[PDB]
Design a protein around this ligand. Structure first.
Ligand SMILES: CCCCCCCCCCC(CCCCCCCCCC)(CO[C@H]1O[C@@H](CO)[C@H](O[C@@H]2O[C@@H](CO)[C@H](O)[C@@H](O)[C@@H]2O)[C@@H](O)[C@@H]1O)CO[C@H]1O[C@@H](CO)[C@H](O[C@@H]2O[C@@H](CO)[C@H](O)[C@@H](O)[C@@H]2O)[C@@H](O)[C@H]1O
Ligand SMILES: CCCCC/C=C/C/C=C/C/C=C/C/C=C/CCCC(=O)O[C@H](COC(=O)CCCCCCCCCCCCCCCCC)COP(=O)(O)O[C@H]1[C@H](O)[C@H](O)[C@@H](O)[C@H](O)[C@H]1O
Ligand SMILES: CCCCCCCCCCCCCCCCCC(=O)O[C@@H](COC(=O)CCCCCCCCCCCCCCC)COP(=O)(O)OCC[N+](C)(C)C
Ligand SMILES: CCCCCCCCCCCCCCCCCC(=O)O[C@@H](COC(=O)CCCCCCCCCCCCCCC)COP(=O)(O)OCC[N+](C)(C)C
Ligand SMILES: CCCCCCCCCCCCCCCCCC(=O)O[C@@H](COC(=O)CCCCCCCCCCCCCCC)COP(=O)(O)OC[C@H](O)CO
Ligand SMILES: CCCCCCCCCCCCCCCCCCCC(=O)O[C@H](COC(=O)CCCCCCCCCCCCCC)COP(=O)(O)OCCN
Ligand SMILES: [Fe+3]
Lengths: 122, 98, 30, 488, 55, 48, 73, 126, 487
């Protein structure tokens, strides 16, 4: 009725490569990368756009097994980005683009493992 | 050393003083040569001045630009004067004195 | 208020004006 | 004893000015009185002034540069072609230097040695165009290559620059080794290195009566080295990576100036490489391969500088088409294409450095640019269409007369491949126009305005590109004179 | 918080120009040449806000 | 006056000399065809 | 059309092109506009003269090349 | 902000704010005409293509959904926007930008007050 | 001294003035653009006064050097054929400005820039005797049409529509460019007067004719390549889509007249049955495809395709009356198709459906639009008394005189033309009124009422008295038919 902002609030458990748990807060309907952007653990200047063509695995996040069966899978190029812009030309089967993952209301308590930030300047 | 100055494209104008001396072409600087030797130096000095105000090198940058412009302007004046002397330039001022 | 009182800018200004004079002469005398 | 130096006179000035700039920038960048000033914009402006002054010195003394030619004969011979190539190389260098000024302030990259090394590379190129020998050519190639290796990895704490610098180093050293082997193995089989005495003992006799394995193999090795320098397929192993990693002002200079000098070297070598069975077919095949690979590789590229690198490779292939003919019209088309490509590359890199202010990386960042900055949008669209060879622009005249020269020699297979690659390249050129006029993404990126240097260069180049097919006579005449002066 | 606004709004012309030039000079940093020159550049105290107003 | 006097004269001064047009076309054809052979012989020159 | 009105117009046009390409009002500095007009006129006139000279010194060289070819027999 | 989001207020493209709109740590999506006397508070969010009627007040942590018309003393729904009227937002913002540019040319840079400064200072002393 | 140079300069001045006009001054932009377009139209009309339809040679010519040796150069001029195309090009563009007049605030000044650029661009195409530069301006129209289709397209699917319209054109363009290079290298120049007087080789004739046909069969919709026109034509703004079928469709068909028929006299005769067997089956297949269509724009485009395939038959049938009838049909089609797309676009600018299912019973309301639509449908219905019938009767006469079989198949086209156009008219503006979908709607105001007035008057004028059009170009058609042979 009153349309509070708190209804579409999604809380996750992003963990830095230093093994520290973080309680991040996002919105339902926007990308997971946007949710990771407010905390600042992912540099906003690197991935300013939300387009798939403008992705080079700089939004790559590692997902636990228990969260991978309740969101749509990699269609054609979500895997291509992983298997192209990586040190090892192989998929992890536990990683997903944070740019393509949209946050749903039921996707609360999700744990995401942000890896070490790769260079993105030029 | 064995030197032989000779142009493949011969001078179109009178060819007085085929191999002039350094001080001679220095002393042959007409009013136009001095004018063009001075304008380049002035441009260089003012460019060195204007460029060196952001870093804070107000004067030494001007001096360096002055050195560069002085060398370039003297080089240009010498080139024009010598080329006029060897003949392959429109002289109309050297045959009059020769 | 009668002299600029800057022993560094005046040389730059005279260099600029003589450069302008040289440019106008080079256009004219050539 | 002093008037003999009027032939090498402009190079002396640029060397001395480089030394003066180095001394000034090392003395006044360490003083505590001026608390270690940046001293990069100052050195850049002084270097641009020096380049303009030596350009004036070279242009005015057109009847000069020929006196005492016998004395300088063993070292360098500068005919009319050399003068017209150098006067254009200096202009391109000055344009690049003027372009890379805002990069020294907003990026805060205050290293004055950058401009000094650019000036030294320019002097090396000047020595290269007139290098009428098998020794001066190699010395000048190495002189520019060292500066390029150093300034490719100029940004140290970055990761793409140093890696690209190392790969460029390895590729260049390997290419130089091959070229030097070829030069040595044609010297030992002929006994001569100077071009006059090399175009006299093998011009009238190449494979007619018999053949020598050493001289043919050395010619092939020289051609392989030259193709490595210009990054022609398949000798393009790492060029796109070099274009990516290298700083954008560097790759603006790395894709315009070196190609002109290397192509001048190839043209000067062609006057003695009269075999016709060792140089034309290899360049024919490499041109075909380069066009095909560039057209089919820039289609998939999503970044900006990678696309520019592959477009440059494709343009190098089109350029080599004109050299494969080996006629006066072929060389004329060659030179016209080189000039047009240099101007258009200056245009594109002016755009890229303009958009570098907000760190544009991918092709999608410049989306919806037709509304935020409509004028820059239409300028960049005109540049892309000029790349496409769209008729009513410059960049179509070059491809036109290139294809005409190709049909002059009766190489009909070259024409069809050129047409197919032109269509394919036009598609992914207009793909950029689609991304920034038609498609409007949800997220917009705003680009800050540029400086007067880039803006003025951009305006001049954009007016040159569009309004070129109304008055193209001077370029055609000068290129025909240059091609005709190559032999007499 | 009010004292920083009070100080900034009450700066003389000969002082505001100096602060503007200093802010322009230290707008962006460059660790590369700073480390290569053996120097370090610290922001002037007049360009640093007191720690009480920072989050 | 009347519209014929104000229209016929203007039209006939705007027609601009049909015979001279044909003559000019003829010598243009001849001159450019002569230049065509010169251009062909220009292209016939060998590179060396 | 006298190689100078086109040059002046092109210089003024490129001046406004540079001025408005930075997202500024077109007539910011009139003095650089007039100096751009002057520079455009000068460059256009010199381009015409250089074209005439290029053709003149290209014909006298193409004639030499053709004569050198014609001495084959 | 109470919502836990970053408290910076960002105004996207083609957004008309309207006079006496007291924005504070809000968040506005593009094409979001805001009426007069608007009291957008901390953490309040406005989704795109929506219009907020004049006099509207909304407490912290209250959002406005996608294209939809609200107003009143609290955040109260009014009606849903039609397609014909929901494209008039960008045109309205463009017209306001045109009028602002019309004002922009009125005054040139580097005002001539300094001349009056010197003239008034010359009246006494230095 | 109203020469051709000013006719091209005036749109250039109009565009240049518009470039430096602030976006806020929307009042001045439209006024000055429309004034420039109307001045260009009057400057084109005055040329018809001083045309001098007596000489076989070319009219006012302007020569501007393009290469250092005057090898090839800008050589202007009209003979008897491109004059009417120049007039109609100068007349259609002000209609384009007027139709997109109300919504100019969103369009901005960039809308008029593209239209005026294309305006003098198509002006420079028809009066361009030099063969190569005819190709330069022949493909120069890619950019303005690309921009018009993409930037101001109706729906979001415009991205794929423009790609076909571009690439299909580029393929044939470069295929023609190769032939141009072969001709220039062989002959030496590309001037039209000389190049028509060069003895060609029969084996070379066929290859060059095929190379020209590679692109000229794309501009006129042929059987193998006609997919681009509907997909890239339904998805363009009404002001812009009205010249894809207006002047952008007459390049290749008219290009046959100027650069194929007199150029290759011995090859067109050898390839005559191929053109017949293409166009005769085109007029059938496209017409049948038209019947099972739902979109309002696509049906008119398909009818245009059928009309062009019909005029192609009468053009390659070398007759003194066949070619004249081809030109009359092309002018009449340029009028009627333009009018039909404005008629079907005024509906879209009010309701935005482009579906015949929603439209129905539009005679009980907006009767003036119904009357105009009925008149233009009758013009497309190929009735005598309108300019079209004069158009295809001469086509049929020219075809039958040469081949009896082709005339019957061609007239099957005008038989089948009554199956889709009349059905559309009775299914759009004469059905049962439905208030479920078309809740409210207005009629034509003073703008679109005046837009159709020149169309109606020109239609009737060229239908009941086509003498002046035939009078002005009997010499040129006679010269074109009699070429190469001497009997
Ligand atoms: C980029 C946009 C293009 C938009 C306009 C395109 C239209 C271009 C036509 C405009 C225009 C200027 C060109 C402007 C260039 C723009 C520069 C861009 C950068 C500017 C910032 C070229 O027009 C003519 O120029 C001639 C130059 O050669 C050429 O004629 C050919 O040349 C022969 C060569 O051998 C050929 O053998 C032959 O076949 C042709 O005779 C042709 O180009 C053309 O006929 C106007 O003509 C100008 O050129 C000359 C002759 O009139 C005039 O100077 C002359 O000099 C003395 C003898 O030189 C004369 O004693 C003196 O009487 C006169 O003063 C000028 O006063 C002016 O009249
Ligand atoms: C009815 C009226 C009709 C209309 C009448 C029309 C009259 C036409 C007159 C035109 C005057 C032409 C002027 C040419 C203008 C050139 C540009 C101005 C140059 C200039 O910044 O000034 C001097 C510099 O000095 C020179 O380094 C080099 C500058 C040397 C050039 C100065 C030459 C001026 C002499 C002009 C002739 C005098 C004739 C006097 C005429 C009046 C007689 C009564 C001040 O330096 P500065 O360090 O304090 O500060 C500058 C300046 O702030 C900016 O450039 C930068 O922001 C800053 O970094 C720094 O560079
Ligand atoms: C003749 C040797 C040839 C080889 C030389 C190689 C040198 C290469 C590198 C050149 C470096 C030049 C360094 C010399 C400058 C040293 C400092 C200096 O002399 O300038 C003075 C003073 O200079 C001037 O004021 C005017 C400069 C002279 C400009 C006159 C025109 C230019 C000279 C013409 C060309 C020079 C010819 C030199 C003799 C051949 C500096 O004054 P400021 O520091 O600006 O004032 C104090 C600032 N503050 C208040 C903040 C403390
Ligand atoms: C072979 C072609 C010859 C030239 C073509 C013209 C020949 C006549 C073609 C038009 C005939 C009339 C058809 C008009 C459309 C019919 C449906 C319609 O829309 O009706 C309209 C239009 O009504 C008309 O019929 C107007 C007829 C005007 C045509 C008169 C001109 C015919 C003679 C001209 C022929 C040329 C003469 C020779 C020129 C040299 C309004 O009718 P209402 O009675 O008001 O009913 C509508 C319901 N409600 C009132 C609720 C809105
Ligand atoms: C051909 C031109 C040759 C002359 C060029 C002189 C070198 C210009 C260097 C300019 C680069 C620079 O140092 O940056 C400063 C910019 O330098 C300038 O502003 C002008 C420098 C001199 C240019 C004018 C001199 C005219 C003389 C030209 C030749 C006559 C910093 O500007 P800012 O920090 O003040 O920006 C804020 C601005 O004030 C707010 O609006
Ligand atoms: C062919 C047909 C189309 C061509 C048409 C040409 C028309 C004629 C040329 C028109 C020129 C108009 C120029 C108007 C005068 C402007 C003067 C401004 C000079 C100026 O402001 O000084 C500096 C700007 O640098 C500068 O402005 C000078 C550096 C500019 C770099 C240009 C390099 C030229 C050499 C290479 C050219 C490319 C050749 C390729 C073959 C400082 O600027 P600021 O005061 O604003 O303060 C710093 C802002 N950052
Ligand atoms: Fe991503």
């Amino acid at each position: 009725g009153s349309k509070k902002v708190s209804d579409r609030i999604v809380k996750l458990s992003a963990i830095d490569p230093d093994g520290y748990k973080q309680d991040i807060i996002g919105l339902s309907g926007q990308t997971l990368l946007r949710a990771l952007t407010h905390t600042g653990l992912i540099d906003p200047a690197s991935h300013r756009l939300d387009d798939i063509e403008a992705c080079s695995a700089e939004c790559e996040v590692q997902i636990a097994e228990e969260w991978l069966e309740k969101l749509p899978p990699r269609t054609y190029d979500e895997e291509y980005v992983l298997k192209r812009s990586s040190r090892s030309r192989i998929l992890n089967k536990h990683s997903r683009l944070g740019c393509q993952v949209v946050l749903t209301q039921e996707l609360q308590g999700m744990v995401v493992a942000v890896p070490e930030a790769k260079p993105w300047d030029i | 050393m064995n030197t032989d100055i000779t142009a493949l494209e011969k001078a179109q104008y009178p060819v007085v003083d085929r191999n002039p001396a350094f001080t001679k072409v220095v002393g042959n600087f007409s009013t136009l040569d001095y004018l063009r030797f001075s304008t380049i130096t002035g441009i260089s000095v003012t460019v060195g001045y204007l460029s060196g105000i952001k870093p804070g090198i107000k004067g030494p940058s001007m001096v360096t630009g002055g050195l560069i412009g002085l060398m370039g302007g003297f080089m240009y004046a010498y080139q024009n004067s010598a080329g006029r002397l060897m003949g392959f330039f429109p002289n109309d001022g050297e045959v009059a004195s020769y | 208020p009668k002299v600029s009182e800057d022993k560094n800018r005046n040389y730059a200004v005279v260099a600029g004006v003589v450069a302008i004079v040289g440019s106008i002469g080079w256009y004219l005398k050539a | 004893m002093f008037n003999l130096f009027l032939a090498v006179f402009p190079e002396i000035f640029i060397i001395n000015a480089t030394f003066i700039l180095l001394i000034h920038g090392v003395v006044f960048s360490t003083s505590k009185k001026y608390d270690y000033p940046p001293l990069a914009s100052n050195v850049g402006w002084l270097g641009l002034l020096s380049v303009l002054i030596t350009l004036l010195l070279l242009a005015a003394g057109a009847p000069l540069l020929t006196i005492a030619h016998l004395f300088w004969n063993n070292l360098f011979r500068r005919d009319n072609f050399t003068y017209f190539c150098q006067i254009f190389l200096l202009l391109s260098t000055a344009g690049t230097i003027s372009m890379c000024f805002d990069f020294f302030d907003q990026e805060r990259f205050d290293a004055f040695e950058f401009i000094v090394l650019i000036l030294l590379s320019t002097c090396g190129m000047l020595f290269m165009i007139s290098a009428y020998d098998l020794i001066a050519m190699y010395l000048a190639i190495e002189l520019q290559s060292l500066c390029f290796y150093v300034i490719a990895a100029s940004k140290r704490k970055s990761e793409f620059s140093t890696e690209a610098g190392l790969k460029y180093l390895i590729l260049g050293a390997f290419s130089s080794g091959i070229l030097l082997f070829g030069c040595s193995m044609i010297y030992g089989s002929t006994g001569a290195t100077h071009f006059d005495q090399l175009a006299k003992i093998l011009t009238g006799y190449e494979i007619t009566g018999a053949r020598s394995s050493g001289i043919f193999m050395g010619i092939l090795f020289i051609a392989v080295g030259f193709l490595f320098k210009i990054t022609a397929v398949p000798f393009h192993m790492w060029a796109p990576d070099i274009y990516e990693g290298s700083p954008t002002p560097v790759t603006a200079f790395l894709s315009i100036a070196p190609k002109i000098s290397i192509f001048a070297n190839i043209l000067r070598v062609f006057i003695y490489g009269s075999y016709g069975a060792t140089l034309q077919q290899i360049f024919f095949f490499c041109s075909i391969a380069s066009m095909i690979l560039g057209a089919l590789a820039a289609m998939a590229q999503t970044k900006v500088k990678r696309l520019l690198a592959y477009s440059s490779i494709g343009h190098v292939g089109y350029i080599c088409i004109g050299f494969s003919c080996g006629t006066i019209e072929g060389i004329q088309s060659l030179l016209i294409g080189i000039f047009i490509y240099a101007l258009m590359t200056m245009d594109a890199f002016a755009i890229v450095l303009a958009l570098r202010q907000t760190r544009v990386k991918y092709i999608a960042d410049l989306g919806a640019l037709a509304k935020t900055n409509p004028i820059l949008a239409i300028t960049f669209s005109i540049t892309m269409f000029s790349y496409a060879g769209i008729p009513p622009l410059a960049g179509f005249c070059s491809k036109f007369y290139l294809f005409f020269a190709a049909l002059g020699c009766g190489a009909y297979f070259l024409a069809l491949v050129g047409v197919v690659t032109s269509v394919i390249g036009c598609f992914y050129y207009i793909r950029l126009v689609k991304r920034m006029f038609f498609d409007t993404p949800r997220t917009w990126i705003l680009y800050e305005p540029m400086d007067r240097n880039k803006s003025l260069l951009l305006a001049m180049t954009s007016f040159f590109i569009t309004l070129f097919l109304l008055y193209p006579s001077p370029l055609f005449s000068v290129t025909h004179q240059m091609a005709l002066s190559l032999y007499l | 918080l009010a004292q920083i606004h009070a100080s900034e709004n009450s700066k003389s012309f000969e002082q505001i120009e100096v602060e503007r030039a200093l802010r322009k000079k230290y707008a962006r940093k460059d660790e590369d040449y700073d480390s290569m020159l053996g120097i370090t550049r610290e922001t002037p105290p007049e360009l640093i806000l007191p720690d009480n107003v920072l989050p | 006056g009347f519209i014929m006097e104000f229209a016929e004269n203007l039209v006939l001064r705007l027609m601009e000399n049909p015979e001279e047009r044909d003559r000019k076309a003829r010598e243009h054809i001849y001159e450019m065809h002569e230049r065509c052979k010169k251009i062909k012989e220009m292209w016939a020159l060998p590179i060396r | 059309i006298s190689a100078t009105m086109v040059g002046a117009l092109l210089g003024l046009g490129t001046q406004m092109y540079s001025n408005a390409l930075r997202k500024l009002p077109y007539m910011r500095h009139p003095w650089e506009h007039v100096v751009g007009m002057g520079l455009g006129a000068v460059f256009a006139n010199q381009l015409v003269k250089w074209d005439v000279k290029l053709k003149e010194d290209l014909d006298v060289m193409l004639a030499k090349a053709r004569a050198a070819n014609e001495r084959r027999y | 902000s109470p919502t836990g989001l970053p408290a910076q207020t960002l105004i996207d493209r083609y957004v008309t704010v309207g006079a006496y709109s007291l924005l504070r740590s809000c968040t506005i999506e593009p094409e979001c005409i805001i009426g007069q006397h608007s009291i957008l508070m901390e953490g309040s969010l406005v989704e795109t293509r929506s219009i907020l009627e004049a006099g509207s007040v909304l407490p912290p942590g209250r959002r406005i959904p996608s294209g939809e018309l609200w107003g009143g003393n609290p955040a109260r729904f009014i009606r849903t926007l039609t397609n014909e009227e929901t494209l008039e937002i960008p045109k309205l913002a463009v017209a306001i930008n045109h009028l602002s540019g019309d004002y922009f040319s009125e005054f040139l840079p580097y005002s001539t007050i300094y001349l009056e400064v010197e003239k008034f200072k010359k009246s006494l002393g230095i | 001294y109203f020469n051709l140079s000013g006719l091209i300069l005036c749109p250039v001045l109009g565009s240049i003035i518009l470039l430096f006009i602030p976006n806020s001054r929307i009042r001045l932009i439209r006024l000055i653009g429309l004034c420039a377009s109307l001045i260009t139209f009057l400057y084109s009309l005055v040329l018809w006064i001083q045309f001098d339809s007596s000489t076989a040679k070319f009219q006012f010519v302007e020569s501007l050097r393009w290469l250092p040796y005057e090898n090839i150069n800008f050589y202007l001029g009209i003979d008897g054929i491109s004059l009417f195309f120049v007039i109609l090009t100068t007349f259609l563009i002000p209609i384009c400005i007027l139709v997109g007049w109300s919504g100019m605030r969103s369009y901005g000044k960039e809308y008029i820039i593209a239209f005026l650029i294309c305006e003098f661009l198509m002006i420079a195409v028809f009066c361009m005797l030099d063969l190569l530069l005819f190709y330069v301006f022949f493909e120069s129209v890619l950019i303005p049409m690309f921009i018009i289709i993409g930037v101001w397209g109706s729906r979001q699917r415009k991205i794929k529509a423009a790609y076909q319209f571009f690439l299909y054109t580029l393929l044939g363009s470069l295929f023609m460019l190769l032939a141009i290079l072969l001709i220039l290298f062989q002959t030496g120049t590309t001037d039209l007067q000389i190049l028509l007087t060069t003895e060609f080789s029969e084996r070379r004739q066929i290859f060059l004719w095929i190379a020209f046909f590679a692109s000229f069969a794309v501009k006129v919709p042929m059987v193998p390549v006609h997919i681009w026109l509907p997909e890239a034509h339904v998805e363009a703004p009404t002001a812009g889509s009205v010249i894809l079928a207006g002047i952008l469709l007459k390049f290749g068909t008219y290009g046959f007249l100027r650069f194929s028929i007199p150029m290759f006299p011995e090859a067109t005769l050898c390839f005559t049955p191929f053109i017949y067997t293409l166009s005769a089956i085109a007029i059938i297949y496209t017409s049948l495809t038209t019947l099972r269509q739902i979109d309002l724009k696509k049906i008119i485009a398909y009818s245009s395709v059928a009309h062009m395939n019909l005029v192609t038959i009468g053009m390659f049938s070398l007759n003194i009356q066949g070619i004249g009838g081809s030109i009359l049909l092309m002018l009449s089609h340029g009028l009627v198709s333009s009018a039909l797309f404005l008629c079907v676009g005024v509906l879209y600018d009010r309701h935005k459906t482009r579906l015949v299912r929603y439209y129905g019973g539009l005679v009980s309301t907006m009767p003036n639009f119904s009357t105009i639509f009925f008149f233009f449908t009758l013009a497309n219905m190929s009735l005598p008394g309108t300019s079209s019938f004069i158009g295809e009767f001469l086509i049929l006469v020219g075809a039958f005189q040469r081949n009896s079989l082709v005339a019957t198949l061609a007239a099957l086209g005008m038989i089948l033309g009554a199956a889709y156009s009349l059905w559309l008219y009775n299914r759009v503006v004469s059905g049962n009124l439905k208030p479920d979908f078309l809740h409210k709607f207005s009629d034509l105001n003073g703008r679109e009422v005046f837009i159709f007035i020149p169309f109606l008057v020109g239609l009737v004028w060229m239908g009941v008295y086509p003498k002046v059009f035939l009078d002005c170009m009997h010499t040129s058609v006679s010269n074109l038919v009699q070429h190469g042979k001497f009997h």
